[PDB]
Design an enzyme around this catalytic site. Structure first.
Site, short mmCIF file in Angstrom:
data_model
loop_
_atom_site.label_atom_id
_atom_site.label_comp_id
_atom_site.label_asym_id
_atom_site.label_seq_id
_atom_site.Cartn_x
_atom_site.Cartn_y
_atom_site.Cartn_z
N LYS B 111 -41.00 -69.46 -11.00
CA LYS B 111 -42.06 -68.41 -11.24
C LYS B 111 -43.16 -68.67 -10.97
O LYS B 111 -44.06 -67.51 -10.37
CB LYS B 111 -41.95 -68.18 -12.94
CG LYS B 111 -40.92 -67.12 -13.43
CD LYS B 111 -40.35 -67.54 -14.72
CE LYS B 111 -41.46 -67.90 -15.75
NZ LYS B 111 -41.12 -67.71 -17.02
N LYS B 189 -27.40 -62.76 -9.32
CA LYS B 189 -27.10 -62.11 -10.63
C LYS B 189 -27.97 -60.98 -10.87
O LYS B 189 -29.14 -60.77 -10.31
CB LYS B 189 -27.47 -62.98 -11.81
CG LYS B 189 -27.15 -62.44 -13.37
CD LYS B 189 -28.01 -62.80 -14.23
CE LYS B 189 -27.42 -63.11 -15.52
NZ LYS B 189 -26.78 -62.29 -16.22
N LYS B 192 -32.93 -58.58 -14.98
CA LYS B 192 -34.03 -57.63 -15.64
C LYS B 192 -35.40 -57.63 -15.08
O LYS B 192 -36.27 -56.80 -15.34
CB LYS B 192 -34.15 -58.15 -17.26
CG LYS B 192 -34.78 -59.64 -17.46
CD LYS B 192 -34.90 -59.78 -18.99
CE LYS B 192 -35.20 -61.31 -19.11
NZ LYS B 192 -33.77 -62.17 -18.78
#
Ligand SMILES: C[C@H]1c2c[nH]c3cccc(c23)S[C@H]1C(=O)O
Ligand SMILES: C[C@H]1c2c[nH]c3cccc(c23)S[C@H]1C(=O)O
Lengths: 328, 325
Positions: B111, B189, B192
């Protein structure tokens, strides 16, 4: 009227040097300023704490502050962990401080010393301290040069938030109003007197009994000259004792010098011991009254209610600016 | 009665992959388990969030969980920031965790990768995540494999706390319902927080958007509708979405489309998604227009606060804070 915020570390019990330097004047300052006195138990567990000792030191500190003259209907005295807003705002401030700003902190680089692995709480000590200050629109923080870097960061974080979201925080300043004499160690008159000295002869605490006060003044460092005269560079020990004596007795240094012309240190010290004992005996009596009274818990209950009123409103405004929660 | 805790990130969306992977089942398990559903707005602000959009997406996610079927008389749905105990317990756990443990978190490294100006909250959010879980004596946390390292730390912090102070925390376990991949890069994947909105279908996409995203879902150029994860991850993932939403096996779908092309298969799949989402979106709009939504969130915070403030009281007593006697 300006606001003052003092965070008080529970673990340490007050020294006379602290009393003379920065606490005694608050008995009167609490009527000219809107004063917050906050026992920072949440900051205390950033290092290893024995639970029973921490709990007792929190209470003792509250009783001591009341015993010296802090008036809970003029000032707000409370325990940090009883106001959830401090933890809430500290998280929000963690989200705007840079990691690099925390790693640079000198106090964090120390305290990290002979530990190797340290708690994340020791790295995020400053955001929580900034929160403590900023939640109450503090104008003045009564700290010395050792907290300079923490106050700078607090001022930086207040300014960053104000410029990103709009003016909300007061920009605090470090200043001790009506600062007293800087009292040095009784054992090393070139070192400041501090509750963390490894030599217990270095300090006198407000809770020392008379025998201990007598022995510590007895062993206090002087010189070989036998002359009561103020000279900080050549007579640091005597000069320090003259500062304690002058402020606790109300007599000027010049008057004490004249008073002791022709006298040696034996009689000056025995007089100083009496001056200290006479100063602490009333404080210790009221202290014992507070420690055995139900009014101490009621006082701390209302301190936390009055602090929470101000701090929870500031939290509502921060959450509103940052997008948290709802408005319903 | 085992306890389930699920965090809901208002900085992101709710994808069909999350619905398939876990969320659909909750409508059932909420009667078997004590379920907490937490909108983690304090986790969202570790990076800049537009305030108005964050406030609005908090409401959207709450309405969406109700629309999907979460039953507020059975489960607890609440907003993390409305329970101060999460911030209080996070601080106490920050005093238990080691800096070295936070720094080697993989999520922190990813991140913060290209980012100038990294907030401390981006490093120190695993303790707040541990707090979200441990406060409710959680037995089961339903997370992706991307979160497995965060669950490990939470388990370590609970044990570290339990050993020092006494058995207070339940040691939680990750649950980890097929694994849906991104429509743009089907070797990842579906996520979100994917920055490419074409990578996912959210539960709020309208018909025209769903058709567009399925149409442009990336696929091979060989052209046979057949499951082959290695050679043909794109159509394989579309087959898996189609299967789990329609109830047909992949083999039955392969036989059904034998000799047919991707265009007709994509149009059928888009309709299947639309028909799945349309009733959800209809209840979503009634909840969004309802006074009742704020009442559900008020009660959820009340119930969450009762359990969490009690756990904080016990933590404070163990560590020596306050006057809890
Ligand atoms: C007590 C500590 C800290 C807690 N939060 C505050 C707020 C104001 C002043 C201080 C503090 S002084 C600082 C120190 O380490 O001396
Ligand atoms: C929502 C995030 C997180 C916040 N605190 C919790 C508690 C339980 C599960 C999760 C979380 S899942 C995790 C994620 O990023 O996927």
């Amino acid at each position: 009227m300006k606001t003052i915020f003092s965070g008080i570390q529970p673990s340490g019990v007050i020294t006379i040097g602290n009393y003379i330097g920065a606490l005694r004047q608050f008995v009167e300052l609490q009527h000219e300023y809107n004063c917050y006195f906050c026992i920072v138990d949440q900051h205390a567990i950033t290092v290893w704490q024995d639970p029973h000792e921490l709990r007792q030191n929190i209470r003792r500190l509250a009783a001591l502050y009341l015993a010296v003259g802090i008036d809970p209907t003029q000032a707000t005295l409370f325990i940090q962990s009883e106001v959830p807003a401090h933890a809430q705002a500290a998280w929000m401030l963690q989200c705007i401080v840079y990691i690099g700003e925390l790693e640079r902190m000198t106090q964090f680089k120390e305290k990290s010393a002979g530990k190797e692995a340290v708690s994340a709480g020791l790295l995020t000590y400053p955001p929580l301290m900034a929160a403590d200050i900023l939640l109450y629109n503090t104008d003045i923080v009564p700290v010395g040069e050792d907290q300079k870097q923490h106050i700078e960061l607090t001022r930086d974080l207040a300014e960053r938030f104000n410029k990103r979201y709009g003016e909300l925080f007061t920009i605090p300043e470090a200043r001790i109003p009506k600062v007293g004499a800087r009292i040095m160690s009784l054992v090393d008159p070139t070192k400041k007197m501090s509750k963390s000295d490894p030599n217990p002869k270095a300090y006198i605490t407000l809770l020392d009994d008379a025998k201990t006060i007598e022995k510590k003044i007895k062993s206090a460092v002087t010189d070989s000259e036998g002359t009561i005269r103020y000279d900080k560079e050549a007579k640091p020990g005597i000069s320090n004792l003259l500062n304690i004596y002058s402020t606790l007795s109300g007599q000027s240094i010049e008057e004490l010098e004249r008073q002791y012309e022709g006298k040696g240190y034996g009689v000056f010290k025995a007089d100083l011991a009496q001056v200290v004992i006479e100063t602490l005996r009333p404080i210790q009596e009221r202290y014992h009254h507070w420690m055995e009274s139900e009014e101490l818990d009621r006082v701390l209950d209302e301190g936390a209610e009055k602090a929470n009123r101000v701090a929870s409103e500031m939290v509502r405004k921060m959450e509103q600016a940052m997008g948290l929660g709802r408005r319903r």
